[model samples]
Target: MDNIIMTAYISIFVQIITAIISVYGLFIPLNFKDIILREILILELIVQIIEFIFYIWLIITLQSINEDITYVRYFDWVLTTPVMLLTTVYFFEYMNSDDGIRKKEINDRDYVYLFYICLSNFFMLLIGYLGETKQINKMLTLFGGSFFLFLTFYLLYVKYTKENWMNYLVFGAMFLLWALYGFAFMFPFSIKNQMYNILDIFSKNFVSIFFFIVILNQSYKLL
Candidate 1:
């Protein structure tokens, strides 16, 4: 009990640190002239702000209940996943423009991709929510939702591979961390909770830090 409590606090603290780094991104000198980059920055800023709020509620739920707070995770994903997808799509559009690739209309290749990705995330969240709240077959829900989620990230990975090796490696690492977290449920509850804490810290908090780093790097290059 004490161990879980400690781990939860540690996770919350890590989230706080991640949130701070994300907030710092807003203060950096950045150019808004490039509309694509501006949209990406705005998406990042909004997600990070929402992430901070989610983590605060998550920590409160954990501290008050003395147990895992599953709803918070669901809510966090539901809100953040779409924004994350939007960020990827916006960045991809920015990259294409940088390479002088022009689109004919608003619903071009990128918008089409964004629409599908956003739709997939919504279904994933919905299925997962029903599985959890309605006591459906959770494994099936997990598998089904993860399939869509994987495809969404896979598309982004394909796009990112064309961008740089760094994007490939970082995003690949993040994806693998998520995979590990998903599988960690097979262990005993105590072990699973510990694994969840460790992976949550790495996959989420650490990833958020890396996201800010990428934003800073891009800002420096662009601005």
Candidate 2:
């Protein structure tokens, strides 16, 4: 019964747990020093590295396992694209210099972290769509839907508790629209219906593109 899809589902669940725990730890009083943030980043880096392996394995096996497998699983491109972008954005502050901060000029780590989050969510959308289409196993799709809900809860929490206006509003809208979109198109029938699949794909690509636009607009100010 075990196969490549099963393995990929396991990997997705592991990632979901790690991401939730890592983000939740942010609210608690931690050792808030230079070392602490760097430690968190290191942990995230390790998770990303593991994801790199899992995605590669999944992508390479996609075509062989099922007829529905298509080009989208190539999402492993993030292991290179996002990682490289994070490095370039943070390079001066950490890679070559003594400073340990993640980004030199950016007041908040929101932009960088949001980029990673959007990247991950895009994969969720991909996974969900694939699973519903019978391209990947159903287990992986279910896990993807579960994680989407998990992240949605976090977004709702931050929206209610955070005092800062923009901080709260930005993510609030993200989770809100996600919930709406889920109910509307991805709920009763799911995201794979040929009729609604376009929404499924658009949701993923739009969120990523939107967050990247935020980074693009902010880079000018950072410089």
TM-scores of the candidates in the order shown: 0.71, 0.31
The alpha-carbon deviation from the true structure for residue 110 of candidate 1, after best TM-score superposition, in angstroms, is: 2.7
Clashes of each: 0, 0
lDDT of 2 by residue, 93-183 (tens): 3323344454534327456554554466566566666765677766666767658656634533442334544544554554554455344
Alpha carbon lDDT of residue 132, candidate 2? 50
Per-residue accuracy of model 1 over 1-223 as CA lDDT, tens digit each: 4565577678777767766776676566655434444445556556656666765675566566654455356776687778766665554555545442322232365677767778877887787666655466768877976887698788777754477655566567757776675566445545665676667677556655655666677677875
lDDT of predicted model 1: 0.63
- Please state the error at residue 56 of candidate 2 in Å: 0.7
Total clashing pairs in model 2: 0
Model 2 Cα RMSD, 1 decimal: 13.7
